[PDB]
Design a binder for this molecule. Structure first.
Ligand code: PLP
Ligand code: PLP
Lengths: 452, 453
């Protein structure tokens, strides 16, 4: 099968996520065939640096034959059994046991899904059921943020703050509210980041008092907003959000679907930013994307609420899927026992953050260079001196991302934010290779900017 | 690693779908370890007949080493790449091509998910986006049925008609409405099933006219209601539903998550019942449950509408997952090339339906014996003569289901409906084994009914 034949069949038969089908079919899809470590090969034999780890999820890198062996052996013994008929199976029990050891104290119970989107729907039903068991049936509104991403179910798209998702499906659904994101570069006016952190967090208080605290169930946030452009909030933000939630008896929910399983150098983003959520959602790096699996980690107080309520009429055919559970077990055992998470905290994370700032800080149309552990970003700007963004935010990002893609480097644009989230196993040498290619692409970018 | 230790760790750490955690933890979870053909083994070494094919999904049976090999090979070459960055990969392209050959003509385009629940959410967003592209932004209400099941996302639970799901989450969401289900035994009054089929279908028209047709986007149904108790509608129902949809310019959606990939002896339930939906949802049997994967099959009309609209701001990280796609490809290739679906239509389906009626018709507390292909059911009743159901629908079903489970037979109760959906590869001899155990369980059931007044 040629590149041509794969493109024609893709065009004729496959509808892609978050894509304009007509424009993709006219352009021709890029066909990825093989992965190894931090590298991909396409159908034309291009070797590509995957600076996005599939979709911020291939945390141990490509080529784990041990994961394929764990999948094969589980699929041969018991490919599926359901967790609905008062039934369980070894793989889901062993994974649940291992996950309780790497999650913080008070996170003993896990509910399994197929995806981050399903984890978020589960978390919404759980937080509403929790407040019904407490005898507060009005306490149902969840608060999220503009430019937050919580997946693509009806519930997750509603809780997310992407207007472009709201406009497709009549979203958000009721009992959903949104506050502004803690994007210092745009909203931080004449304030330091730390001052801005407190102002941005107090938008949650303003929103709670406008709705009424007795109607507010939860505040939900990514510790770092991922799909929104790696928006790293100031150090003062999360402690103030937490204070506000505790003051108004609002559950605090971390969406750990990106940050989870080592991306920040801690096991979870909320540990890096110093807040204690009541629940958190995970997927992606839970299996390093080798198989679909998600989870909701339920803290003791919410777990006791759900259990005291009797039947929880929620769950998926493939909840606790044995093969997915065996793969997630191999992945979490590798992250811990091979020191991959520890390595992000004390070796590759500090190296990446230093080298990312050394590489990009000098460019005249780059600003707000930021990141932690192995997630990093910057913003393309029209005038750095005035902190002026390009108009039609996203047009210049597209141009830069296409230069990267043409030069066999995967880094993505969210608007005019450029983001990177490579495999956590990336070597220092591979960080320097990636940065040399990105640096040359940015010199091409600046020259092309001036040329128009 | 003992039964004991697995039960303690499950109790301490695992929250199960659709379960009362406190009551499960006190009872102890039954630990399933091994599967082969139609059989399971538990941690105590019980050999069990799986009359439910996992959860109506393990259509080719347990023990396909070829599927494990396809998974292993794909996971070694390219375990994951996303379909978001103007990117694709061979496994999803090959699966999409094979799926177009086994779907009806005019279903060329497939959107991939991880689950039937995500397929249903995708279908809701697609139906609403379609009507926006047509310039009809109020055409947004989807109609389902009481006792319909459309999964467990907020969207799917809303569209489904399980009040026990609606009461947890403040559901349904807006633009969801429900009509009564075509359950002849309960609602069919003085009528033949065929007459009742027309009346039950016309409840859709009455509901469309009550809401206003310009506000109605779609009618969605399972060809056979699965989780609701294998409610098999009369032959007249689906053609009338389709007429009503066409009359009022309402999209017709089949939820094929159970019926799909051969359960009825056709590839899809809507083919057996003789209706042409505009879209249908699939999962379960798509991979025979060997890996999580769902899909929405989009007909030409809706595909043209979605494509004319430009960006579809919808999809999942694991949409088109390569390993799941390679396994789904092996499963659909086996269903077609090994004659498994054809064998349901021609051989095992007719045998099961005949033997199911022969076995269960004689019992004084069994009525409405029904089924098609390899899905079958009956209803436990208080008084057969008067067609009276037990009060507290579900209590007598629980008793019967527990007798089955205690006798190493998995058949489920939905309320007082007993349901069976075994692997499609079940032999005639395995059908007779399953029915002999179920028949003895029903004699025990009747005796303990009478004993306990
Ligand atoms: C990717 C993502 C999700 C959704 O996960 P799927 O597995 O794509 O359904 C949810 N929340 C966040 C923060 C994510 O980054
Ligand atoms: C099982 C089922 C679903 C939901 O599928 P998951 O894969 O459990 O999310 C949806 N619709 C019908 C008819 C089903 O039977």
């Amino acid at each position: 099968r040629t590149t041509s034949q794969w493109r024609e069949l893709d065009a004729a038969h496959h509808l892609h996520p978050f894509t304009d089908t007509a424009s993709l079919n006219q352009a021709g899809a890029r066909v990825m065939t093989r992965g190894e470590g931090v590298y991909l090969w396409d159908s034309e034999g291009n070797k590509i640096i995957d600076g996005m780890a599939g979709l911020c999820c291939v945390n141990v890198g490509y080529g784990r034959k041990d994961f394929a062996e764990a999948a094969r052996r589980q699929m041969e013994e018991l490919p599926f059994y359901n967790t609905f008929f008062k039934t369980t199976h070894p793989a889901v029990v062993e994974l649940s046991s291992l996950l309780a050891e790497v999650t913080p104290a008070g996170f003993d119970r896990v509910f399994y899904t197929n995806s981050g989107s399903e984890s978020v729907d589960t978390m919404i039903r759980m937080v509403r059921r929790y407040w019904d068991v407490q005898g507060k049936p009005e306490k149902k509104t969840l608060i999220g943020r503009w430019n937050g991403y919580h997946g693509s179910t009806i519930g997750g798209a509603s809780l997310g703050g992407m207007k472009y998702m709201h406009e497709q499906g009549d979203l958000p659904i009721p009992g959903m509210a949104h506050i502004e994101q803690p994007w210092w570069y745009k909203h931080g006016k004449d304030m330091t980041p730390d001052e801005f952190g407190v102002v941005a967090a107090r938008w949650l208080e303003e929103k709670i008092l406008e709705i009424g605290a007795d109607k507010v169930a939860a505040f939900v946030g990514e510790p770092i907003q991922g799909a929104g452009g790696v928006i790293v909030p100031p150090a003062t933000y999360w402690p103030e959000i937490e204070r506000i939630c505790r003051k108004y008896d609002v559950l605090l929910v971390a969406d750990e679907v990106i940050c989870g399983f080592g991306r920040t150098g801690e096991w979870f983003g909320h540990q890096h930013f110093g807040f204690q959520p009541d629940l958190f959602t995970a997927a992606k790096g839970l299996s390093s994307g080798y198989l679909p699996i998600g989870a909701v980690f339920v803290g003791k107080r919410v777990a006791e609420g759900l259990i005291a309520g009797g039947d929880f009429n929620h769950g998926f055919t493939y909840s606790g899927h044995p093969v997915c559970a065996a793969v997630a077990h191999a992945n979490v055992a590798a992250l811990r026992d091979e020191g991959i998470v520890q390595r992000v905290k004390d070796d590759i994370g500090p190296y990446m953050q230093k080298r990312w700032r050394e590489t990009f800080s000098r460019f005249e149309h780059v600003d707000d260079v930021r990141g932690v552990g192995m997630v990093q970003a910057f913003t393309l700007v029209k005038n750095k001196a005035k902190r002026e963004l390009f108009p039609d935010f996203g047009e210049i990002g597209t141009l830069c991302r296409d230069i990267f893609f043409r030069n066999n480097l995967i880094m993505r644009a969210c608007g005019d934010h450029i983001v990177s989230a490579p495999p956590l196993v990336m070597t220092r040498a591979e960080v320097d290779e990636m940065l040399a290619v990105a640096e040359r692409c940015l010199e091409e970018f600046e020259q092309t900017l001036k040329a128009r």
